[PDB]
CSV table of C-alpha atoms in Angstrom, one decimal:
chain,number,residue,atom,x,y,z
M,1,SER,CA,29.2,0.7,16.7
M,2,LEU,CA,26.1,-1.2,15.7
M,3,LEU,CA,26.9,-0.8,11.7
M,4,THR,CA,30.8,-1.6,12.6
M,5,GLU,CA,29.7,-4.9,14.2
M,6,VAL,CA,27.2,-5.8,11.3
M,7,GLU,CA,30.0,-5.5,9.0
M,8,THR,CA,32.2,-7.3,10.6
M,9,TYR,CA,30.0,-10.4,11.1
M,10,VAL,CA,28.8,-10.2,7.6
M,11,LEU,CA,32.5,-10.3,5.9
M,12,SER,CA,33.3,-12.7,7.9
M,13,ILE,CA,31.4,-15.2,6.0
M,14,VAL,CA,32.6,-13.7,2.8
M,15,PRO,CA,35.2,-15.4,0.7
M,16,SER,CA,38.7,-13.9,0.7
M,17,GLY,CA,39.7,-11.9,-2.2
M,18,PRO,CA,38.6,-9.0,-4.4
M,19,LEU,CA,34.9,-9.1,-4.1
M,20,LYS,CA,35.3,-9.1,-0.5
M,21,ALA,CA,36.7,-5.4,-0.4
M,22,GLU,CA,34.1,-4.7,-2.9
M,23,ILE,CA,31.4,-5.7,-0.1
M,24,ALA,CA,33.4,-3.7,2.6
M,25,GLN,CA,33.4,-0.6,0.4
M,26,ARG,CA,29.7,-0.7,-0.9
M,27,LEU,CA,28.8,-1.7,2.8
M,28,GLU,CA,30.6,1.1,4.1
M,29,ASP,CA,28.9,3.7,1.6
M,30,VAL,CA,25.5,2.4,2.4
M,31,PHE,CA,26.3,2.6,6.0
M,32,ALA,CA,27.4,6.2,5.7
M,33,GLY,CA,24.1,7.0,3.7
M,34,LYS,CA,26.0,7.3,0.4
M,35,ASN,CA,25.6,5.1,-2.5
M,36,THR,CA,21.9,5.5,-2.7
M,37,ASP,CA,19.3,3.1,-4.4
M,38,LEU,CA,18.5,-0.1,-3.6
M,39,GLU,CA,17.7,-2.1,-6.7
M,40,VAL,CA,21.0,-1.1,-8.3
M,41,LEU,CA,22.9,-2.8,-5.4
M,42,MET,CA,20.5,-5.9,-5.1
M,43,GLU,CA,20.9,-6.5,-8.8
M,44,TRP,CA,24.6,-6.1,-8.6
M,45,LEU,CA,24.5,-8.6,-5.4
M,46,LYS,CA,22.4,-11.1,-7.6
M,47,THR,CA,24.9,-11.3,-10.4
M,48,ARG,CA,28.0,-11.6,-8.2
M,49,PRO,CA,30.2,-14.7,-8.8
M,50,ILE,CA,31.9,-16.7,-6.1
M,51,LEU,CA,29.4,-15.7,-3.3
M,52,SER,CA,27.1,-18.6,-2.1
M,53,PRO,CA,23.3,-18.0,-2.4
M,54,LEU,CA,23.0,-17.8,1.5
M,55,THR,CA,25.7,-15.0,1.7
M,56,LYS,CA,23.9,-13.1,-1.0
M,57,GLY,CA,20.5,-13.8,1.0
M,58,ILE,CA,22.3,-12.3,4.0
M,59,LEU,CA,23.8,-9.3,2.1
M,60,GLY,CA,20.4,-8.8,0.2
M,61,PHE,CA,18.9,-8.7,3.8
M,62,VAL,CA,21.3,-6.4,5.2
M,63,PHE,CA,21.2,-3.7,2.3
M,64,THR,CA,17.5,-4.0,2.3
M,65,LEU,CA,17.5,-2.9,5.9
M,66,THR,CA,20.2,-0.4,5.9
M,67,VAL,CA,19.0,2.0,2.9
M,68,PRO,CA,17.2,4.9,3.9
M,69,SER,CA,14.2,3.9,1.5
M,70,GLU,CA,13.3,0.8,-0.5
M,71,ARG,CA,10.8,2.4,-2.3
M,72,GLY,CA,8.3,-0.1,-3.7
M,73,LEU,CA,11.0,-2.3,-4.5
M,74,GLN,CA,9.4,-5.6,-4.1
M,75,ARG,CA,11.3,-8.2,-2.1
M,76,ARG,CA,13.9,-10.0,-4.3
M,77,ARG,CA,13.2,-13.8,-5.2
M,78,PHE,CA,17.0,-14.4,-5.3
M,79,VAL,CA,17.0,-13.6,-1.6
M,80,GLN,CA,13.7,-15.4,-0.9
M,81,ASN,CA,15.2,-18.6,-1.9
M,82,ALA,CA,18.5,-18.2,-0.1
M,83,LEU,CA,16.6,-17.6,3.1
M,84,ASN,CA,14.2,-20.2,2.9
M,85,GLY,CA,15.7,-22.7,5.2
M,86,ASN,CA,15.3,-25.1,2.6
M,87,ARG,CA,11.7,-25.5,3.1
M,88,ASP,CA,12.3,-27.7,6.2
M,89,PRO,CA,9.5,-27.7,8.5
M,90,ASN,CA,11.8,-28.4,11.5
M,91,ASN,CA,13.8,-25.3,10.5
M,92,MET,CA,10.5,-23.3,10.1
M,93,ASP,CA,9.2,-24.2,13.5
M,94,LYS,CA,12.4,-23.1,15.3
M,95,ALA,CA,12.4,-20.1,13.1
M,96,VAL,CA,9.0,-19.1,14.4
M,97,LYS,CA,9.9,-20.0,17.9
M,98,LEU,CA,13.0,-17.8,17.8
M,99,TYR,CA,10.8,-14.9,16.0
M,100,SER,CA,8.2,-15.4,18.8
M,101,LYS,CA,11.0,-14.4,21.2
M,102,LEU,CA,12.7,-11.4,19.1
M,103,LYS,CA,9.5,-9.9,18.9
M,104,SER,CA,9.8,-8.2,22.4
M,105,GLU,CA,13.3,-7.2,21.9
M,106,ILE,CA,14.8,-3.8,21.0
M,107,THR,CA,18.5,-4.2,21.6
M,108,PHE,CA,21.1,-5.7,19.5
M,109,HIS,CA,22.9,-7.4,22.3
M,110,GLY,CA,19.6,-8.9,23.5
M,111,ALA,CA,18.7,-10.1,20.3
M,112,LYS,CA,21.7,-11.6,19.3
M,113,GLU,CA,22.2,-13.7,22.6
M,114,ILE,CA,18.9,-15.3,22.3
M,115,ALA,CA,19.4,-16.2,18.5
M,116,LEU,CA,22.9,-17.8,19.4
M,117,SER,CA,21.3,-21.0,20.9
M,118,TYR,CA,19.7,-21.8,17.0
M,119,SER,CA,21.3,-23.5,14.2
M,120,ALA,CA,22.4,-21.5,11.1
M,121,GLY,CA,19.6,-22.9,9.3
M,122,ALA,CA,16.7,-22.0,11.7
M,123,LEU,CA,18.3,-18.4,11.7
M,124,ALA,CA,18.3,-18.0,8.2
M,125,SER,CA,14.9,-19.4,8.1
M,126,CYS,CA,14.2,-16.6,10.8
M,127,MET,CA,15.7,-14.0,8.8
M,128,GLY,CA,13.6,-15.3,5.5
M,129,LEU,CA,10.4,-14.9,7.7
M,130,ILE,CA,11.3,-11.2,8.4
M,131,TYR,CA,12.5,-10.6,4.9
M,132,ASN,CA,9.2,-12.0,3.6
M,133,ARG,CA,7.0,-9.8,5.8
M,134,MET,CA,5.4,-12.6,7.8
M,135,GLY,CA,7.3,-11.6,10.7
M,136,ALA,CA,8.4,-8.0,12.2
M,137,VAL,CA,11.1,-6.7,14.3
M,138,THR,CA,13.3,-3.7,15.3
M,139,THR,CA,16.3,-2.7,13.2
M,140,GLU,CA,18.6,-3.6,15.8
M,141,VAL,CA,17.0,-6.9,16.6
M,142,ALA,CA,17.1,-7.7,12.7
M,143,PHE,CA,20.8,-6.9,13.0
M,144,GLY,CA,21.4,-9.1,16.0
M,145,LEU,CA,19.7,-11.8,14.1
M,146,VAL,CA,22.0,-11.3,11.1
M,147,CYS,CA,25.2,-11.3,13.1
M,148,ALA,CA,24.3,-14.4,15.3
M,149,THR,CA,23.3,-16.1,11.7
M,150,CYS,CA,26.7,-15.2,10.3
M,151,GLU,CA,28.5,-16.3,13.6
M,152,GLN,CA,26.9,-19.5,13.6
M,153,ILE,CA,27.8,-19.9,9.9
M,154,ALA,CA,31.3,-18.8,10.4
M,155,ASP,CA,32.1,-21.1,13.3
M,156,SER,CA,31.0,-24.0,11.1
M,157,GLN,CA,33.9,-23.5,8.8
Q,1,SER,CA,-13.1,-29.4,-12.3
Q,2,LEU,CA,-11.0,-28.5,-9.4
Q,3,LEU,CA,-10.5,-25.0,-10.7
Q,4,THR,CA,-14.4,-24.0,-11.0
Q,5,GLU,CA,-14.1,-25.4,-7.7
Q,6,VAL,CA,-11.4,-22.8,-6.5
Q,7,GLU,CA,-13.6,-20.4,-8.2
Q,8,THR,CA,-16.8,-20.9,-6.5
Q,9,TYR,CA,-14.9,-20.9,-3.2
Q,10,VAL,CA,-12.9,-18.0,-3.7
Q,11,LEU,CA,-16.2,-15.9,-4.9
Q,12,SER,CA,-18.0,-16.9,-1.7
Q,13,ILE,CA,-15.7,-14.3,0.3
Q,14,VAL,CA,-16.2,-11.7,-2.2
Q,15,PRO,CA,-18.8,-8.7,-1.5
Q,16,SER,CA,-21.6,-8.6,-4.0
Q,17,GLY,CA,-21.8,-6.0,-6.7
Q,18,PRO,CA,-20.3,-5.5,-10.4
Q,19,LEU,CA,-16.8,-6.0,-9.2
Q,20,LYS,CA,-17.7,-9.6,-8.2
Q,21,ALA,CA,-18.7,-10.4,-11.6
Q,22,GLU,CA,-15.4,-9.0,-13.0
Q,23,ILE,CA,-13.2,-10.9,-10.7
Q,24,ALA,CA,-15.3,-14.1,-12.0
Q,25,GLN,CA,-14.7,-13.2,-15.6
Q,26,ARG,CA,-10.9,-12.6,-15.3
Q,27,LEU,CA,-10.6,-16.0,-13.1
Q,28,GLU,CA,-12.5,-17.7,-16.0
Q,29,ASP,CA,-10.4,-15.8,-18.7
Q,30,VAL,CA,-7.1,-17.1,-16.7
Q,31,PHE,CA,-8.4,-20.8,-16.6
Q,32,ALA,CA,-9.4,-21.0,-20.1
Q,33,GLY,CA,-5.8,-19.5,-20.7
Q,34,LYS,CA,-7.1,-16.4,-22.3
Q,35,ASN,CA,-3.6,-15.3,-22.6
Q,36,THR,CA,-3.5,-13.1,-19.5
Q,37,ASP,CA,-0.3,-11.6,-18.3
Q,38,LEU,CA,0.1,-11.9,-14.2
Q,39,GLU,CA,1.7,-8.2,-13.7
Q,40,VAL,CA,-1.4,-6.9,-15.3
Q,41,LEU,CA,-3.7,-8.9,-13.0
Q,42,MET,CA,-1.8,-8.3,-9.9
Q,43,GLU,CA,-1.9,-4.3,-10.4
Q,44,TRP,CA,-5.5,-4.7,-11.0
Q,45,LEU,CA,-6.5,-6.5,-8.1
Q,46,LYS,CA,-4.1,-4.1,-6.0
Q,47,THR,CA,-6.1,-1.1,-7.2
Q,48,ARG,CA,-9.7,-2.6,-6.7
Q,49,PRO,CA,-11.8,-0.6,-4.1
Q,50,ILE,CA,-14.4,-2.6,-1.9
Q,51,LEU,CA,-12.1,-5.7,-1.6
Q,52,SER,CA,-10.0,-6.1,1.8
Q,53,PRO,CA,-6.4,-6.8,1.6
Q,54,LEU,CA,-7.1,-10.3,2.8
Q,55,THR,CA,-9.5,-10.9,-0.3
Q,56,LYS,CA,-7.0,-9.3,-2.5
Q,57,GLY,CA,-4.1,-11.6,-1.0
Q,58,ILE,CA,-6.2,-14.5,-1.3
Q,59,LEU,CA,-7.1,-13.7,-5.0
Q,60,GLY,CA,-3.4,-12.9,-5.7
Q,61,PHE,CA,-2.5,-16.3,-4.3
Q,62,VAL,CA,-5.2,-18.1,-6.9
Q,63,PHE,CA,-4.0,-16.1,-10.1
Q,64,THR,CA,-0.1,-16.6,-9.3
Q,65,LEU,CA,-0.8,-20.1,-8.7
Q,66,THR,CA,-3.2,-20.6,-12.2
Q,67,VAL,CA,-1.5,-18.1,-14.5
Q,68,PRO,CA,0.9,-20.0,-17.1
Q,69,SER,CA,4.0,-18.3,-15.8
Q,70,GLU,CA,4.7,-15.2,-13.8
Q,71,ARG,CA,7.5,-14.2,-16.3
Q,72,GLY,CA,10.2,-13.3,-13.6
Q,73,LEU,CA,7.5,-11.0,-11.7
Q,74,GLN,CA,8.5,-10.5,-8.2
Q,75,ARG,CA,6.2,-11.8,-5.5
Q,76,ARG,CA,3.8,-8.7,-4.3
Q,77,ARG,CA,3.9,-6.7,-1.1
Q,78,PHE,CA,0.3,-6.3,-0.9
Q,79,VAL,CA,-0.1,-10.4,-0.8
Q,80,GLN,CA,2.5,-10.7,1.4
Q,81,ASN,CA,1.2,-8.3,4.0
Q,82,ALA,CA,-2.3,-10.0,3.5
Q,83,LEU,CA,-1.2,-13.7,3.9
Q,84,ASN,CA,1.2,-13.1,6.9
Q,85,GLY,CA,-1.3,-14.5,9.7
Q,86,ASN,CA,-1.0,-10.9,11.0
Q,87,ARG,CA,2.8,-11.6,11.8
Q,88,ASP,CA,1.2,-13.7,14.7
Q,89,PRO,CA,3.5,-16.4,16.0
Q,90,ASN,CA,0.7,-18.5,17.0
Q,91,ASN,CA,-1.0,-18.5,13.5
Q,92,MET,CA,2.5,-18.9,12.2
Q,93,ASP,CA,3.3,-21.9,14.6
Q,94,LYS,CA,0.0,-23.6,13.3
Q,95,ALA,CA,0.7,-22.8,9.7
Q,96,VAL,CA,4.1,-24.6,10.2
Q,97,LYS,CA,2.4,-27.5,11.5
Q,98,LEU,CA,-0.3,-27.9,8.7
Q,99,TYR,CA,2.2,-27.2,6.0
Q,100,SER,CA,4.3,-30.1,7.6
Q,101,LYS,CA,1.1,-32.2,6.6
Q,102,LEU,CA,0.3,-30.8,3.5
Q,103,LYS,CA,3.6,-31.8,2.2
Q,104,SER,CA,3.1,-35.6,2.2
Q,105,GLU,CA,-0.6,-34.5,1.1
Q,106,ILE,CA,-1.5,-35.6,-2.4
Q,107,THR,CA,-5.2,-35.2,-3.1
Q,108,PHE,CA,-7.4,-31.9,-3.0
Q,109,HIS,CA,-10.0,-33.3,-0.6
Q,110,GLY,CA,-7.2,-34.7,1.6
Q,111,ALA,CA,-5.6,-31.2,2.0
Q,112,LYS,CA,-8.7,-29.5,2.3
Q,113,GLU,CA,-9.9,-31.9,5.1
Q,114,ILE,CA,-6.9,-31.6,7.2
Q,115,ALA,CA,-6.8,-27.8,6.6
Q,116,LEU,CA,-10.3,-27.0,7.6
Q,117,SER,CA,-9.3,-28.1,11.4
Q,118,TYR,CA,-7.1,-25.0,11.3
Q,119,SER,CA,-8.2,-21.5,12.2
Q,120,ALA,CA,-8.4,-18.8,9.4
Q,121,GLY,CA,-5.7,-16.7,10.5
Q,122,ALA,CA,-3.3,-20.1,10.7
Q,123,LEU,CA,-4.8,-20.8,7.0
Q,124,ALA,CA,-4.1,-17.6,5.7
Q,125,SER,CA,-0.5,-17.7,7.2
Q,126,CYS,CA,-0.1,-21.0,5.7
Q,127,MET,CA,-1.0,-19.9,2.2
Q,128,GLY,CA,1.8,-17.0,3.1
Q,129,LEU,CA,4.3,-19.8,3.9
Q,130,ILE,CA,3.7,-21.1,0.1
Q,131,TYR,CA,3.4,-17.8,-1.6
Q,132,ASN,CA,6.8,-16.8,0.1
Q,133,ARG,CA,8.8,-20.0,-1.2
Q,134,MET,CA,9.3,-21.0,2.4
Q,135,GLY,CA,7.2,-24.0,1.7
Q,136,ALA,CA,6.0,-26.1,-1.5
Q,137,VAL,CA,3.0,-28.2,-2.1
Q,138,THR,CA,1.4,-29.8,-5.3
Q,139,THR,CA,-1.0,-27.4,-6.9
Q,140,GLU,CA,-3.7,-29.7,-5.9
Q,141,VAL,CA,-2.9,-29.4,-2.4
Q,142,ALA,CA,-2.6,-25.8,-2.8
Q,143,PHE,CA,-6.0,-25.6,-4.5
Q,144,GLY,CA,-7.2,-27.5,-1.3
Q,145,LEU,CA,-5.6,-24.8,1.1
Q,146,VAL,CA,-7.4,-22.0,-0.4
Q,147,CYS,CA,-10.6,-23.5,-0.5
Q,148,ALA,CA,-10.4,-24.6,3.1
Q,149,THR,CA,-9.2,-20.8,3.8
Q,150,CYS,CA,-12.3,-19.4,2.0
Q,151,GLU,CA,-14.7,-21.8,3.6
Q,152,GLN,CA,-13.4,-20.9,7.1
Q,153,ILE,CA,-13.8,-17.2,6.4
Q,154,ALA,CA,-17.3,-17.7,4.5
Q,155,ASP,CA,-18.4,-19.7,7.5
Q,156,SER,CA,-17.2,-17.0,10.2
Q,157,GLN,CA,-19.3,-14.7,8.2
């Protein structure tokens, strides 16, 4: 299941312990269409301890895509910094290169496979590019990108 | 003064009429620091008739850059959508290339010079990288980048 897969890849990069079962629960409620309202979750996430800025950025990216509507909720600075690729032009170049390819994909698996050739930083930057409205993709591709990003991050630990 | 320079360049891409006189006054007010709030200014811009999304975006970039502080105001969706080079991979590729060079640039004239070598689309995309926190440049250089963008847009007109 698309969302089942997303949850597994996302949690893989989340520290073990209490907070993790919290993210699992919130992720599942949002996926089930339950716990509505994007800015409440985002603010909760922004202020959570233990989580690294990147994993918050990755989660922030997920909630933003999965909630029915974000309304006029502006994109969060905290997420924007986390997915900034460290302002490294090299990551950016790769990000755009990767974006150019994902642009024609519409399936989760097709998107996941092409993005796995890139570094975790290149992928986070691509995510950033999409989160910042400068790049656009389908929900399934965005999710593939997230999973590849998580896989890459996880396999480096 | 670099600022009055930015004003003229920015004003060059605004159509004539009473609205242009107001933009001029608000810019001059910001420069003199007539204690103007960013949220207030951005909402004003956002809702102006006549001005196109691009002009609105360019002006929004100048205001956030010259206000004393954003006061924690999240970046605006209307600007992000205006400065995304139309989400085109090529303008984006060129933008990253220009950013890569502006990064090491330190003067207004130098940034402007190199900037004028790129297309208007790659310049708006570049302004987007800055506005989205994906890249970072010294103010004077950013000032160079906007004037270049305006010069290229004014020329094609």
